Design a binder for this molecule. Structure first.
Ligand SMILES: Nc1ncnc2c1ncn2[C@@H]1O[C@H](COP(=O)(O)OP(=O)(O)OP(=O)(O)O)[C@@H](O)[C@H]1O
Ligand SMILES: Nc1ncnc2c1ncn2[C@@H]1O[C@H](COP(=O)(O)OP(=O)(O)O)[C@@H](O)[C@H]1O
Ligand SMILES: Nc1ncnc2c1ncn2[C@@H]1O[C@H](COP(=O)(O)OP(=O)(O)O)[C@@H](O)[C@H]1O
Ligand SMILES: Nc1ncnc2c1ncn2[C@@H]1O[C@H](COP(=O)(O)OP(=O)(O)O)[C@@H](O)[C@H]1O
Ligand SMILES: [Mg+2]
Ligand SMILES: [Mg+2]
Lengths: 243, 58, 397, 66, 398, 69, 116, 139
């Protein structure tokens, strides 16, 4: 009963060592100081923070707001499915275990070898071949943050929302390392780029290139490995298909 | 400095668009977002100087 | 109710060669304006009349307080309490003081309320928010039916729709036909729809309201329909009146299932416009005029016979109408004797009234290029292809 | 440079329309295979196997097109 | 050829020489006229601006001040779920309009029986206690309503819907005025009927016609009215409407353009209220409902059997029907007594009844154009040429 | 005052809600209710001054799920 | 009011209508003389060398926009800068023209020989 | 008080930590491409007097095109690392927002921020997201 609750806002700028330009959500913006004991180094622009409702001072930082869709896709239990429950995938399951998990165990091994840990891999095959279950088992063995995402569920009529969702997915992944991005049915997003010009496929190309940037773009990726399963590997975009 | 300090402690005045000078003492003015009021005019401001659709201070 | 508006000064426009008949008439007008100025300055010079009641008015003002907020009387209850909405959108169950005119209280009329403990303390019959005040025409446009060339059928129809009911309407109820509530002009751009609206607003005897269509749409929730309601309420209050909504397709497009909030608000605003169009009886003396270029894109409910019976067509001018427009716009020019103007008209093209006006303007500019003002026929020759920018040659012969 | 000691010149000489991304792949895959076989210096066998794995370019093309 | 821009001497000579001798005087005079006009406009003032001040001796300024210092305002709200009070949890969550929503309790002056989901309630401002339920009242003055008890449209005023009017007769006249045949036949009288067709076919007035001959009051309710500004309370509105339908001896309840509702929180509230009113009210009653629409968008939960027993399609009028409509609308105008209305009805294929009325209106328009107090067949010919059709059909067909 | 619990964060738990006065609001302590179910969307009654979740109330609806009775 | 567009044909007819928009002025690509003038304005601040024939450079631009001419001047300056000099020579302008006006053509002779 | 002209910007820059670690040495080859980028993105920012002496405006804005995975985004990463300019990394698909007019507003905001800051660089990866050839859009 002695707590009064707090505003929530986003830090816009570090005006000086003490004055922080902070925008409250769906409201006005202020210049506000921070608490006496706080990690100003972690008060990066865009960092969601809390504000004392009376004195309007930076109270405590908050982890980045997560999209409800991303939250829902992020909190489905893998069900601790065991590697015994796969069936006859020994060489491929070993290869996948290598390319995903080994960077999550001995990066020193790779760096002494000198390779950059792999960013991710594609798992192509006919339907019912167990790609979803295989990835679920990989997550369960890892017991890490799992993002079971199906591509057909992120295309939207709202024009800039699909790429925004991809950005939110990858921002969540960067925030919650170690995370596993399992993008099922990737043929519904990366289906080659062509200039026929219909609006729908054009928006699909925009989403694909947003994925390509979020995946091997300017911002280098650390400790985030992706799994993309499809039934038509041959229609994938060459830019996405590239190493 | 003292005069500026004194005048700096008084609250700001809402700007508003005068709909019309209703009477010689009352002026219908719309101020965003409170709505529209019929305010009075202090001694200094002359009504005839108040024209419709001019920004005034309340 | 009150009376109409849109006062205008003398037509003048009987002479144009600046032959001092203009000067004499204008001097008479100026003399009358001077007597206006002097008379009112004298009347304000001596006019002692004030106080009288004072005390009762002073105490009623004290009761009202200062400031007083205006709201919309959305609904009434037993004759001491009512429901009033502030301009924000919040409405409250408030009390009604004795000194209010209980006959004036009706759903919609603006009510003066107390700033604290809201309570109806007055009624304002002239709210007329600045936007709708702007849409009301004050100075009649200088254009008139003399300036309109051709469109004789169109002028006939528009006068039979908006003037004949305003003037002697006995023919209408004598035949028993209800007057045409609302008229939509349409046609290719620059045919003369807005010009005809101007001419109507000139030779008028009713409050003329000019609207842009896109003007009605407003950012805030419910502001759109509220403004449309205010416009039509002003139309009824100052009836007889003519409500001209230019570019009706700014809102008149086909109604479709709205998804976003903004499109829902646009649908609400058009629904309110249609409801207001249905609200007043056609026997009422308020008419609407809507002009557009893309008639085919309008909702086929706005143009229903039960809502807008008439549909005036503004086709591209014919050769005789083309020469009429050329004569009209060349009236103020000092054309030479060599000019014929017939070659331009005879050329099979799609000239419009705007195109012909621009051709005349460009011919004048070409004449000014040669330091002359008599404007040869060669000036028009050049101007025609100067302003007319943009079938494969011998395919059709 | 970050690779192990390990004929890279011949591999360069091989005419293959491959980008720098493919070269980075080839090298990374060579390292990954060496990790699989538990040897800390790649050489002709695993490096060549990674090279084949990277630039597949398998036609699977019906011969009537050619 | 490079054209030369006008120089200062060029401009100066242009303004003179080829000028009327009276240029300066006329232009100056016009300028003073405009300036004097603006002078008069700014000086004439505004005037009252007369607030709604009652005539004196009607003023109780003492009591007015007493109310100002005693009575309090209440914000109104739309009350929502009752939270299953049962006298121990009387709180309800109420939405004060564009303001927030609060879970609150009652004032001592109101019993919970007076408060129910979806009614407008006036509440205080800090405790937000529901102080008084605010029923939206029912009156034909507000909105539009039935505004009719015995319509003036008779069976002679309807044409082109002989099969449709026969079906409507079986729907309404047979159970209402002849309940004995349905009773002894042991068949439930038609609980629900829908009247679908293109707009302007005549549908509404057809029901109105039978509404005059069914010896029951006609009810007009517009779906757009339920969906426009009069949304929300509309459910309660129709509640009261259905309630008054129970009060009268027989009501011909009919909803105009149900497409605005049949195809939305408060809209769904009004729908479910309609469902409760229909499925709840005993089908043996005498307030049988007539349903009509233009777009057969109706929710599948509606036409399930037991809610809409019959469907009637109102197609475009035929030659006999169109000529009947022409004669009907000519009865109300000054025309000659030898007009070949069969000719005109032939000249208007696939024309709506409203189109026929507009055609008659345009015939009168053309008669007025020639200032002839009697419209001629030529006038109707030009009217149909104008309205209908909005060389090809004569140089190939003959 | 009604409010939609935006989500729950860890610090031994904190919350962030969105009140019906279109305002987001961080609570270091989740009022006077339990803290397990608390769905991100669970409408709650939060105090009108000190802004802590005083009670939980049943969900309103899911739009179209109300459309079908 | 002045308006600009690269695509006049797609503008609304109600906007291109005269009285709303008069004198639909077209800006064609500069001809040889005009290209020479444009080169001379954009080479005004350069450090030219004696024996420079800007007329030849303008002739080296079949149907080049003025922006391309300014880009050619900039690229010639860049070529001079590469050799850490301040003057620019004729060959600098020639290779600047080659670089700036370079465009991909139809590689397939078979496609290019469809038309006579 | 008055704030810096564009402090309250929705779009953020490249902070010191966000700067990538790729160096110009890590980019094998591409000597001519490195030179042609540096001549317009690095040299004018540090050797303006060199351009002024020749009396020419330095090239402003460069397109980097070619087959995928040939070094474009890495060259941009290196340029961001090896520069004193304020770097605004954006991607074409990021510009396309949901609400009408928000995309152009973001473009205006980005360029305004770059203008109000020091000599700055705007890198827009995947420009063909938004800059495809214009056509008669019908929706
Ligand atoms: N019949 C006419 N006679 C003389 N002038 C005409 C005529 N028709 C059009 N004009 C000229 O065209 C100009 C523009 O016309 P107007 O504003 O009425 O266009 P409009 O046809 O309503 O087109 P839009 O609505 O597409 O702008 C007028 O100022 C007038 O000078
Ligand atoms: N190794 C496997 N290969 C194929 N299917 C499997 C395997 N193991 C389990 N399954 C079955 O596949 C089902 C899950 O669908 P799954 O095949 O994983 O999705 P996908 O269509 O992506 O392959 C499980 O119910 C399970 O019975
Ligand atoms: N010149 C090069 N030097 C070193 N590595 C390179 C080179 N070119 C490509 N690579 C490798 O390929 C990838 C190239 O990505 P990049 O070419 O920037 O993508 P895009 O071309 O789609 O922007 C890098 O991750 C790098 O590992
Ligand atoms: N059978 C009919 N008898 C008489 N008038 C008709 C008939 N059908 C249509 N009309 C005419 O059509 C006009 C509009 O009919 P209305 O009932 O409003 O159409 P809707 O059925 O779409 O409501 C009426 O004014 C009426 O004069
Ligand atoms: Mg016009
Ligand atoms: Mg890239």
């Amino acid at each position: 009963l002695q707590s009064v609750g707090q505003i929530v806002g986003e830090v816009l700028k570090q005006l000086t060592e003490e004055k922080f330009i902070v925008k409250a959500t769906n409201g006005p913006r202020y210049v506000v100081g921070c608490r006496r004991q706080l990690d100003k180094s972690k008060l990066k622009p865009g960092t969601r923070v809390a504000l004392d409702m009376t004195t309007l001072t930076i109270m405590r930082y908050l982890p980045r707001e997560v999209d409800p869709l991303v939250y829902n896709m992020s909190h489905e239990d893998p069900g601790n499915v065991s590697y015994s429950e796969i069936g006859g995938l020994s060489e491929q399951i070993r290869e996948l275990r290598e390319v995903i998990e080994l960077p999550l165990t001995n990066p020193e091994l790779f760096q002494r070898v000198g390779i950059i840990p792999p960013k991710g891999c594609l798992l192509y095959g006919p339907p019912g071949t167990g790609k979803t279950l295989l990835a679920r088992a990989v997550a369960s063995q890892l017991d890490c943050n799992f993002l079971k995402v199906v591509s057909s569920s992120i295309v939207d009529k709202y024009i800039g929302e699909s790429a925004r969702l991809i950005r939110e997915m990858f921002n969540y992944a960067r925030d919650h390392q170690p995370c596993i991005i399992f993008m099922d049915e990737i043929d519904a997003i990366g289906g080659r780029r062509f200039s026929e010009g219909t609006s729908a496929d054009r928006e699909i190309q925009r989403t694909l290139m947003e994925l390509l940037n979020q995946m091997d773009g300017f911002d280098t990726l650390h400790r985030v490995k992706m799994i993309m399963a499809t039934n038509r590997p041959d229609t994938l975009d060459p830019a996405l298909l590239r190493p | 400095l003292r005069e500026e300090l004194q005048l700096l402690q008084e609250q700001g005045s809402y700007v508003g668009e005068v709909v019309r000078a209703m009477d010689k003492k009352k002026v219908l003015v719309k101020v965003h977002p409170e709505g529209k009021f019929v305010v009075d005019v202090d001694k200094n401001i002359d009504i005839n100087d108040v024209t419709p659709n001019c920004r005034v201070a309340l | 109710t009150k009376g109409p508006d849109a006062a205008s000064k003398l037509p003048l426009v009987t002479p144009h060669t600046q032959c001092r008949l203009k000067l004499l008439k204008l001097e008479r007008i100026k003399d009358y304006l001077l007597m206006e100025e002097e008379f009112i300055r004298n009347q304000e010079q001596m006019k002692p009349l004030e106080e009288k009641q004072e005390e009762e008015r002073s105490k009623v003002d004290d009761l009202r307080g200062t400031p007083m907020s205006v709201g919309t009387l959305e609904e009434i209850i037993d004759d001491n309490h009512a429901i009033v909405s502030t301009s924000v959108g919040s409405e409250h169950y408030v009390s009604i003081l004795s000194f209010v005119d209980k006959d004036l209280l009706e759903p919609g009329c603006s009510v003066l309320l107390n700033h604290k403990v809201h309570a109806v303390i007055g009624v304002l019959m002239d709210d007329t928010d600045p936007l709708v005040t702007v849409m009301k025409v004050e100075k009649a446009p200088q254009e008139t039916y003399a300036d309109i060339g051709g469109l004789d059928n169109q002028i006939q129809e528009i006068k039979e729709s908006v003037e004949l009911p305003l003037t002697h309407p006995e023919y209408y109820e004598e035949m028993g036909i209800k007057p045409p509530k609302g008229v939509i002009l349409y046609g290719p751009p620059g045919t003369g729809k807005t010009l005809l609206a101007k001419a109507v607003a000139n030779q008028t005897s009713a409050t003329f309201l000019r609207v842009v269509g896109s003007e009605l749409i407003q950012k805030y929730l419910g502001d759109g329909p509220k403004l449309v309601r205010e416009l039509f309420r002003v139309a009824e209050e100052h009836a007889p009146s003519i409500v001209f909504i230019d570019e009706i397709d700014a809102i008149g497009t086909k109604r479709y299932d709205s998804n976003s909030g903004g499109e829902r608000e646009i649908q609400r605003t058009m629904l309110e416009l249609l409801n207001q169009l249905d609200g007043f009886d056609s026997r009422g003396d308020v008419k609407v005029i809507m002009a557009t270029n893309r008639i085919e894109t309008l909702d086929p409910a706005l143009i229903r016979p039960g809502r807008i019976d008439r549909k005036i067509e503004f086709p591209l001018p014919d050769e005789k109408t083309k020469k009429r427009i050329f004569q009209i716009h060349t009236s103020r020019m000092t054309l030479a004797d060599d000019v014929t103007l017939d070659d331009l008209i005879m050329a099979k093209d799609d000239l419009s009234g705007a195109d012909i006006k621009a051709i005349c303007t460009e011919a004048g500019l070409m004449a000014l290029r040669e330091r002359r003002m008599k404007v040869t026929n060669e000036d028009f020759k050049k101007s025609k292809e100067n302003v007319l920018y943009k079938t494969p040659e011998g395919l059709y012969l | 440079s970050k690779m192990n000691l390990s004929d890279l010149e011949d591999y360069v000489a091989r005419p293959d329309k491959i980008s720098g991304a493919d070269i980075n792949s080839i090298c990374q895959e060579s390292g990954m295979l060496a990790v699989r076989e538990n040897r800390y210096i790649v050489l002709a066998k695993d490096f060549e196997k990674a090279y084949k794995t990277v630039i597949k370019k398998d036609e699977q093309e019906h011969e009537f097109y050619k | 050829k490079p054209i030369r821009a006008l120089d200062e001497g060029d401009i100066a000579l242009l303004k003179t020489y080829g000028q009327s001798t009276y240029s300066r005087q006329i232009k100056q005079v016009e300028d003073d006229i405009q300036q004097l006009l603006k002078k008069i406009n700014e000086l004439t003032g505004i005037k009252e601006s007369d607030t709604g001040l009652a005539p004196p001796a009607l003023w109780d300024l003492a009591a007015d001040k007493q109310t100002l210092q005693s009575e309090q305002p209440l914000q109104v709200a739309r009350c929502t779920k009752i939270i299953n009070a049962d006298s121990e949890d009387p709180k309800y969550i109420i939405n004060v309009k564009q303001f927030a929503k609060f879970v609150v309790d009652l004032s001592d002056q109101v019993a919970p029986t007076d408060i129910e989901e979806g009614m407008r309630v006036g509440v205080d401002r800090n405790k937000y206690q529901i102080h008084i339920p605010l029923p939206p009242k029912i009156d034909p003055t507000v909105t539009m309503m039935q505004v009719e008890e015995k319509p003036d449209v008779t069976y002679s005023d309807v044409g082109g819907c002989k099969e449709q009017i026969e079906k409507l007769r079986e729907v309404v006249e047979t159970p209402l005025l002849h309940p004995e045949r349905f009773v002894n036949l042991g068949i439930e009288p038609p609980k629900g009927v829908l009247l679908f067709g293109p707009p302007g076919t005549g549908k509404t007035l057809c029901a109105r016609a039978v509404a005059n001959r069914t010896d029951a009051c006609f009810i007009r309710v517009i779906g757009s009215e339920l969906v426009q500004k009069y949304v929300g309370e509309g459910a309660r509105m129709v509640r009261e409407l259905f309630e008054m339908a129970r009060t009268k001896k027989a009501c011909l309840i009919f909803f105009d353009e149900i497409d605005a509702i049949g195809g939305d929180n408060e809209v769904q509230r009004t729908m479910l209220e309609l469902i409760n009113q229909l499925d709840g009210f005993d089908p043996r009653g005498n307030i049988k409902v007539l349903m009509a629409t233009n777009r057969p968008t109706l929710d599948p939960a509606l036409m399930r059997p037991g809610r809409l027993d019959r469907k009637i399609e109102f197609s475009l009028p035929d030659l006999e029907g169109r000529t009947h409509i022409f004669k009907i609308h000519a009865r109300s105008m000054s025309v000659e007594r030898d007009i070949r209305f069969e000719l005109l009805a032939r000249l208007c294929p696939n024309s709506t009844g409203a189109e026929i009325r507009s055609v008659c209106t345009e015939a009168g328009m053309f008669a007025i154009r020639a200032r002839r107090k009697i419209a001629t067949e030529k006038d109707f010919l030009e009217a149909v040429n104008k309205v209908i059709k909005s060389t090809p059909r004569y140089m190939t067909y003959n | 005052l009604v409010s939609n619990v935006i989500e729950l964060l860890d610090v031994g738990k904190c919350a962030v809600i969105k009140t019906s006065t279109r305002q987001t609001y961080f609570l270091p302590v989740i009022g006077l209710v339990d803290a397990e179910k608390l769905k991100p969307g669970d409408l709650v009654g939060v105090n009108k001054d000190s802004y802590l979740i005083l009670e939980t109330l049943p969900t309103e609806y899911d739009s179209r799920v109300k459309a079908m009775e | 009011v002045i308006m600009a567009t690269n695509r006049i044909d797609i503008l609304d007819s109600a906007l291109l209508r005269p009285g709303r928009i008069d004198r639909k002025i077209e800006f064609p690509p500069p001809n040889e003389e005009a290209r020479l003038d444009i080169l001379k304005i954009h080479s005004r601040k350069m450090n030219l060398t004696r024996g420079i024939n800007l007329r030849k450079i303008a002739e080296l631009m079949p149907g080049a926009s003025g922006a391309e001419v300014k880009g050619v001047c900039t690229e010639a300056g860049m070529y001079a800068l590469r050799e850490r000099r301040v003057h620019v020579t004729q060959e600098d302008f020639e290779m600047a023209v080659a670089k700036v006006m370079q465009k991909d053509s139809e590689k397939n002779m078979s496609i290019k020989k469809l038309w006579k | 008080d008055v704030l810096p002209p564009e402090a309250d910007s929705s779009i953020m820059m490249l902070t010191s930590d966000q700067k990538p670690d790729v160096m110009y040495a890590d980019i094998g080859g591409m000597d001519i491409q490195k030179q042609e980028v540096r001549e317009a993105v690095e040299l004018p920012l540090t050797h303006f007097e060199l351009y002024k002496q020749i009396g020419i405006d330095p090239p402003r804005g460069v397109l980097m095109y070619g087959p995928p995975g040939c070094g474009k985004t890495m060259l941009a990463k290196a340029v961001a690392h090896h520069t004193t300019a304020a770097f605004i990394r954006v991607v074409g698909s990021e510009f396309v927002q949901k609400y009408l007019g928000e995309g152009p507003r973001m473009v205006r905001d980005v360029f305004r921020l770059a203008k109000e800051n020091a000599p700055a660089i705007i890198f827009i990866d995947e420009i063909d997201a938004i800059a495809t050839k214009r056509f008669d859009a019908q929706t």
